[PDB]
């Protein structure tokens, strides 16, 4: 999604559903290859230690002056009619300048946006309908005429324009947690295994304190841990090394 070939429009933002995987979030925070990094309700330093049911990477492009409208509970033409964020948005929004990638000779006019809609969209909603609306009862039904504006306006992304007009590839990282079990987690940074030393351990499922040492025992291919007769952990299998 970060290195995608091209981003969609702001009214037809592509909802990239991601589930059943693990990936680092601070890798982008400490990348120094972004123009905007502002999370809402969660810090990027702690996001690695949080699990969620599913996440969405909403890809779209907007102008530099329009990035201010991408926020939870913020009004605007692209916030109310193209892509609204909820008041309880516990995700993160990121963006980066794409003037050297999305620009074209004389300006890229392929990107579009919904200038207005009859009603405001719900959070995490997109509308690709080209239906036009009139002021009075005069029916247009397709082509324009007699004050029935066309809602989808085109973007002007010139290669030599100011920073407020250059294209910015935005990626809204939404997070969701429901009764279903959490599938999207971050990486748990492991340490070097120390043997024959009384050291505290923190394995995949079990934790404790004791002397870590190998033996001649053989667990089954699926058995990850081991306990004695009294339900006390007596042996384990290292998650990294079999």
């Amino acid at each position: 999604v970060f290195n995608a070939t091209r981003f969609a429009s702001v009214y037809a933002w592509n909802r990239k559903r991601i589930s059943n995987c693990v990936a680092d979030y601070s890798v982008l925070y400490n990348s120094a290859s972004f123009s905007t990094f502002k999370c809402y309700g969660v810090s990027p330093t702690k996001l690695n230690d949080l699990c969620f049911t599913n996440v969405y990477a909403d890809s779209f492009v907007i102008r530099g002056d329009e990035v201010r409208q991408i926020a939870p509970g913020q009004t605007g033409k692209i916030a109310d009619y193209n892509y609204k964020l909820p008041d309880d948005f516990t995700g993160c929004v990121i963006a980066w300048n794409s003037n050297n990638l999305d620009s074209k000779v004389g300006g890229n006019y392929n990107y579009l946006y919904r200038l207005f809609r009859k009603s405001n969209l719900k959070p995490f909603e997109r509308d690709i309908s080209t239906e036009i609306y009139q002021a009075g009862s005069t029916p247009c039904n397709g082509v324009e005429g007699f004050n029935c504006y066309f809602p989808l306006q085109s973007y002007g992304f010139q290669p030599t324009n100011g920073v407020g007009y250059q294209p910015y590839r935005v990626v809204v990282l939404s997070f969701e947690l429901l009764h279903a079990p959490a599938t999207v987690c971050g990486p748990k940074k492991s340490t070097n295994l120390v043997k024959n030393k009384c050291v505290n351990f923190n394995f995949n499922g079990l934790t404790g304190t004791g002397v870590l040492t190998e033996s001649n025992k053989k667990f089954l291919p699926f058995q990850q841990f081991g306990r004695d007769i009294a339900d006390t952990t007596d042996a384990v299998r290292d998650p990294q090394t079999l």
Partner: antibody
Amino acid sequence: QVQLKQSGPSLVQPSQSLSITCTVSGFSLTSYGVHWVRQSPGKGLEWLGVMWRGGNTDYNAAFMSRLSITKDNSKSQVFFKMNSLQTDDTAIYYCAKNGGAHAMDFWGQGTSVTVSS
Amino acid sequence: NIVLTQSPASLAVSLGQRATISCRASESVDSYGNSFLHWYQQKPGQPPKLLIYLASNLESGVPARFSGSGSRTDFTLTIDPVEADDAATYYCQQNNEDPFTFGSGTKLEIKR
């Protein structure tokens, strides 16, 4: 890239007809509208008509029966049939790309049509 | 013929000042949720170009100083800070009612 310069007229006499061919460039003629105006004949800037995105045409109250727009999608040329041109109608005609809210985003250089005996 | 009384006819604005160009209209309002119009700028050696559509949006090519607002009848353009590159006439095109006539034309002069 985006240029709608006009061509075709050389000299007009009073009470005559003549068409103006406007070059199309920078957008698809089949899905974008084309406006037509003059250049301040006396009072401020005026408006003549418009060809919508593949539909019908609208014109001013006074130029309803006199001026007409004809969009040729095969040749990518927009013709502007004029009728009953008087000496007071001397002005520069411009073409422009139709925007979202009936706006005129980009413009062309146009051509000066001189009406005189 | 929509009578878009754009006033004043011209202003001599110096560097680092604010320009004011009014636009009064009657026909009409309630397009979808607002009743704003478009603005333009014509240099003496170039045709006009769209600056502000619906009196609330910017356009690529010019800086962010071009902004404004307006009531149901009167509309105002705000250029702040004005510099020595604004020798051009500004117009007001109505979009809520036909015909799409323009304003009288306010020519800002570089007061040097």
